[PDB]
């Protein structure tokens, strides 16, 4: 079912290579961890926040 | 609870072994495990010479 | 770039036989199947066959099996197709192409096709007659003049008018196969009526490929 | 053994304009179906290996997509390089097949045919057969046809024909038709007609002769 590629680098932009990873989210309603900064900033103290 | 096991301890030297230790003790949070599983049942494991 | 080049085209009379070959040229044949398809005049594109460069390994259509045998040599990086019993059916445009291994690819590398023709009457010049010209003119004020141009053998023939001088108001059909096994077309040239009878209007139809030409002379007669 | 089939049988298309082509095998054949592009004279040009793999050196303009079986080609913005035959091609299972090839058109001007009925010839009858000939001059639409008659009876199988190619700036043609008779039979029927007819005529066009005229 499978065929071997001729990847070559005497290929045009179409048929080079090309690395690809794929994120796919999770659709979980109670989810936790692969979680990033809300835009985080600096503390700031003595001024109304 | 909602796929989550949640785990709580305390471990003390005790004087008392036919009951468990008198007096207000509260256990410290250790976990919140996202494993998606129905728990009804339970075992323990010893190991074996 | 990789090509594919045909060669081994011709007639063979009927009940008999013919080779063709290409070459592979930029591209070594083994990986690949080299087939053989077939484009009879007015018909689409048919699959004759198929080899294994590589291996040796055959696959042939129905519609040829027990006459047309394939094979192909790496050392030479060639291949071959053996026609036998041909018959006038199997008049078509033989050509060459390519595959990946055994299939689910189409195929990439393409000759240009060799014409292989079966008939009964291999060799024979046209026979030309003139259309007379409506004596009543049409839309734009035009009449044409014509000729029929039949039995010939074989295809290609180019028709000009007035000996080539004339190619306005030329309008030319294509050549078909007829069931006399010689091909067939016809031609007029459309023009301000009365120059019909000013310019010179002959039928000039040329056939390279069988050493001959006909020059027939079509005027206007009474109509 | 797998076989497929295309339509339409031609497209009419204007330089600038989409292209849509079509071939629906009667087994899947997966997504193996490549395609070709041929102009007379030339081999066909691979376009297209499999549904959604085209070949390096093919226009961009070549595209496609499925639903279900049937696979939709086309081109997004036709050029004069690519008026040809496009033919469908499945690599799955033996024997190879192809598609029957899709004429593409460059869609000007509908016009009626001048109509032009040439009785046989003197010269032609000299060769013991007769060849009633008509011939449709600059038309279009791509199709047409004569209705042929002897006596004024609709005539059928007793015709011929060869068509012409489409002018560049008309995408008119003209059509060819001829009856034949052997000179004997012609000489036993009076009157011939050629009554022409095509997809944009709504008033057929009948010209018509005695027999012995012209």
């Known amino acids: 079912p499978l065929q071997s590629y001729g990847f070559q680098p005497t290929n045009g932009v179409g048929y080079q290579p090309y690395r690809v990873v794929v994120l796919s989210f999770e659709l979980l309603h109670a989810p936790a961890t692969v979680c990033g900064p809300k835009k985080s900033t600096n503390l700031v103290k003595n001024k109304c926040v | 609870i909602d796929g989550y096991f949640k785990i709580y301890s305390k471990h003390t030297p005790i004087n008392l072994v036919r009951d468990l230790p008198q007096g207000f003790s509260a256990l410290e949070p250790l976990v919140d495990l996202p494993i998606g599983i129905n728990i009804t049942r339970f075992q323990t494991l010893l190991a074996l010479h | 770039e990789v090509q594919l080049v045909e060669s081994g085209g011709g007639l063979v009379q009927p009940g008999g036989s013919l080779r063709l070959s290409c070459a592979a040229s930029?591209?070594?044949?083994?990986?690949?199947?080299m087939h053989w398809v077939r484009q009879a005049p007015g018909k689409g594109l048919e699959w004759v066959a198929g080899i294994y460069a590589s291996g040796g390994a055959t696959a042939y259509a129905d519609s040829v099996k027990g006459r047309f045998t394939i094979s192909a040599d790496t050392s030479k990086n060639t291949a071959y197709l053996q026609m036998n019993s041909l018959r006038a059916e199997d008049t078509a445009v033989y050509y060459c192409a390519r595959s990946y291994y055994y299939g689910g690819f189409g195929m990439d590398y393409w000759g240009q096709g060799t014409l292989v023709t079966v008939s009964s009457a291999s060799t024979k010049g046209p026979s030309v007659f003139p259309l007379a010209p409506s004596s009543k003119s049409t839309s734009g004020g035009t009449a044409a003049l014509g000729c029929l141009v039949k039995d010939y053998f074989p295809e290609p023939v180019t028709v000009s008018w007035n000996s080539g001088a004339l190619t306005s108001g030329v309008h030319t059909f294509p050549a078909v196969l007829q069931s006399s096994g010689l091909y067939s077309l016809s031609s007029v040239v459309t023009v301000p009526s009365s120059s019909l009878g000013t310019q010179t209007y002959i039928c000039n139809v040329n056939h390279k490929p069988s050493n001959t030409k006909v020059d027939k002379k079509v005027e206007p007669k009474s109509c | 053994d797998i076989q497929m089939t295309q339509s339409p049988s031609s497209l009419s298309a204007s330089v600038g304009d989409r292209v849509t082509i079509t071939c629906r095998a009667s087994?899947?054949?997966?997504?193996?179906v490549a395609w070709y592009q041929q102009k007379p004279g030339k081999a066909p040009k691979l376009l297209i290996y499999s549904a959604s793999d085209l070949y390096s050196g093919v226009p961009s303009r070549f595209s496609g997509s499925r639903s279900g079986t049937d696979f939709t080609l086309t081109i997004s913005s036709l050029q004069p390089e690519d008026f040809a035959t496009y033919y469908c091609q499945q690599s799955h299972t033996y024997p190879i097949t192809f598609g029957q090839g899709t004429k593409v058109e460059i869609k000007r001007t509908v016009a009626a045919p001048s109509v032009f009925i040439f009785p046989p010839s003197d010269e032609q009858l000299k060769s013991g057969t007769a060849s009633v000939v008509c011939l449709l001059n600059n038309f279009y639409p791509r199709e047409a046809k004569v209705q042929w008659k002897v006596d004024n009876a609709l005539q059928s199988g007793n015709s011929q024909e060869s068509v012409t190619e489409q002018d560049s700036k008309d995408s008119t043609y003209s059509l060819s038709s001829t009856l034949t008779l052997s000179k004997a039979d012609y000489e036993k029927h009076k009157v011939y007609a050629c009554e022409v007819t095509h997809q944009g005529l709504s008033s057929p066009v009948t010209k018509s002769f005695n027999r012995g005229e012209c």
């Open positions: 930029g591209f070594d044949l083994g990986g690949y199947s």
């Open positions: 087994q899947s054949v997966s997504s193996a």
